[PDB]
Amino acid sequence: SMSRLSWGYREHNGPIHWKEFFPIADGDQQSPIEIKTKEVKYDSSLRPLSIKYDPSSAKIISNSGHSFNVDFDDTENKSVLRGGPLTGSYRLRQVHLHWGSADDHGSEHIVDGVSYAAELHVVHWNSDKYPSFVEAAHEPDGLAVLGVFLQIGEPNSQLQKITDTLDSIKEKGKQTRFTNFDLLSLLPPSWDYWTYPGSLTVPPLLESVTWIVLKQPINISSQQLAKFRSLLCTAEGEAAAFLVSNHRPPQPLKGRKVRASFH
Ligand SMILES: [Zn+2]
């Protein structure tokens, strides 16, 4: 039932089928990509990240059917990302996660042929030039997305806040209030990053993202990660299907340059 409104990660509506209704899927700046450190170039002009995330900005966590979405109030300017490869202020809007059916392959971006267990995406939009996320999403400099790798390790106290809510949003469409979320404390201690021009990794797959992938991963226990696979990509009352995997395969680099803020 693949369509312009119905897409997913299953056999009939997975990534390979996305181009059927979203032509840009075969574009020149698609994400994710494989980051080959041998091909990465240090750029001293890249600046450190300057981040401020107000714990009260988070408002709701819901099951979109494609992942869990923690939505933030982006009508105010309390949580913003500056610095890095960015010009101007990018306002925090959403946080979601990508994983795979097994712990050995779940991240979207790949590093030197290796897949981490999962990958967190923190979505921001240029509020200096655009009136809202929608208009920013259609501009090359419109979005800034921080990517954070998750690797299996000791239980993560910060991620636990999210896992504690999963049973309440098991079905697609379910939502529960989620605030007092210290997102900054979820990020790794080192803010060193790789950056390149890309796109949303889910339809509409718009090429408006300046990707900022942090080098240092954070840990998550196998049990915590398994909790995400217990979510359904289907709603209450519909035939059940678990969201066992929700990551897109690596896309052609097409001559793009991946830069490092560290050396
Ligand atoms: Zn994402």
In the 8-state DSSP scheme, what is residue 249? P
Structure tokens at 166: 């999963």
User: Cβ of 259: how many Cβ atoms within 10 Å?
Assistant: 16
Alpha carbon of 77 to ligand 1 centroid (Å): 22
Task: Specify whether 109 is catalytic.
Answer: no
Q: How far is CA 248 from CA 1, 18, 27, 72, 215, in A?
A: 19, 10, 15, 24, 20
Burial of 260 (0-12, 13-18, 19+ CB in 10 A): middle
Resolution in Å equals 1.5
By three-state DSSP, how is residue 6 classified? coil
Alpha carbon of 262 to ligand 1 centroid (Å): 24
Question: Is residue 263 part of an annotated ligand binding site?
Answer: no
DSSP letters, 163-227, are: HTTGGGG-SBT-EEE-----GGGGS-S---EEEEEE--SSTT--S-EEEEEESS-EEE-HHHHHH
CA dihedral angle for residue 13, residue 15, residue 19, residue 23, rounded to 10 degrees: 130
CA dihedral angle for residue 201, residue 74, residue 64, residue 11, rounded to 10 degrees: -10
CATH number, domain containing residue 113: 3.10.200.10
Q: Rounded to whole angstroms, how far apart are CA atoms 24 and 19?
A: 7
DSSP letters, 120-160, are: EEEEEEETTT-SSHHHHTTSTTSEEEEEEEEEE-S--HHHH
Alpha carbon of 47 to ligand 1 centroid (Å): 24
Question: Is residue 98 part of an annotated ligand binding site?
Answer: yes
Alpha carbon of 206 to ligand 1 centroid (Å): 12
User: Cβ of 44: how many Cβ atoms within 10 Å?
Assistant: 7
Q: Rounded to whole angstroms, how far apart are CA atoms 157 and 69?
A: 19
Alpha carbon of 97 to ligand 1 centroid (Å): 6
Of 12, 66, 124, 138, which one is the catalytic site residue?
66
Alpha carbon of 118 to ligand 1 centroid (Å): 11
Alpha carbon of 248 to ligand 1 centroid (Å): 9
Q: What count of Cα atoms within 13 Å lies in the side-chain half-sphere of residue 155?
A: 9
* Residue linked to tokens 């960015």: 86
Question: Is residue 121 part of an annotated ligand binding site?
Answer: yes
Question: Is residue 124 part of an annotated ligand binding site?
Answer: no
Structure tokens at 63: 């099951």
Type of residue numbered 51? I
Experimental method: X-ray
Q: Give me the phi and psi of 76, to 5 degrees please.
A: -115, 165
SS3 content of the chain, % helix, strand, coil (to 5): 15, 30, 55
Q: Give the CA diameter of the chain.
A: 54
Long-range contact pairs involving 239-243 (C-beta distance under 8 Å, separation at least 24): 241/10, 243/9, 243/65, 243/66, 243/67
Is 14 within 8 Å of 248 (Cβ atoms)?
A: no
Q: Rounded to whole angstroms, how far apart are CA atoms 124 and 16?
A: 27
Residue 148 belongs to what domain range?
1-263
Is 214 within 8 Å of 193 (Cβ atoms)?
A: yes
Q: What residues contact residue 131 under an 8 Å CB cut-off, 6+ apart?
A: none
User: Cβ of 201: how many Cβ atoms within 10 Å?
Assistant: 24
Domains: count for the chain: 1
Q: What residues contact residue 173 under an 8 Å CB cut-off, 6+ apart?
A: 62, 63, 65, 235, 236
Is 196 within 8 Å of 256 (Cβ atoms)?
A: yes
| Nearest by Cα to 100 from 249, 216, 209 | 249
Is 151 within 8 Å of 219 (Cβ atoms)?
A: yes
Q: Rounded to whole angstroms, how far apart are CA atoms 77 and 81?
A: 10
Question: Is residue 17 part of an annotated ligand binding site?
Answer: no
Q: What residues contact residue 251 under an 8 Å CB cut-off, 6+ apart?
A: 30, 31, 32, 33
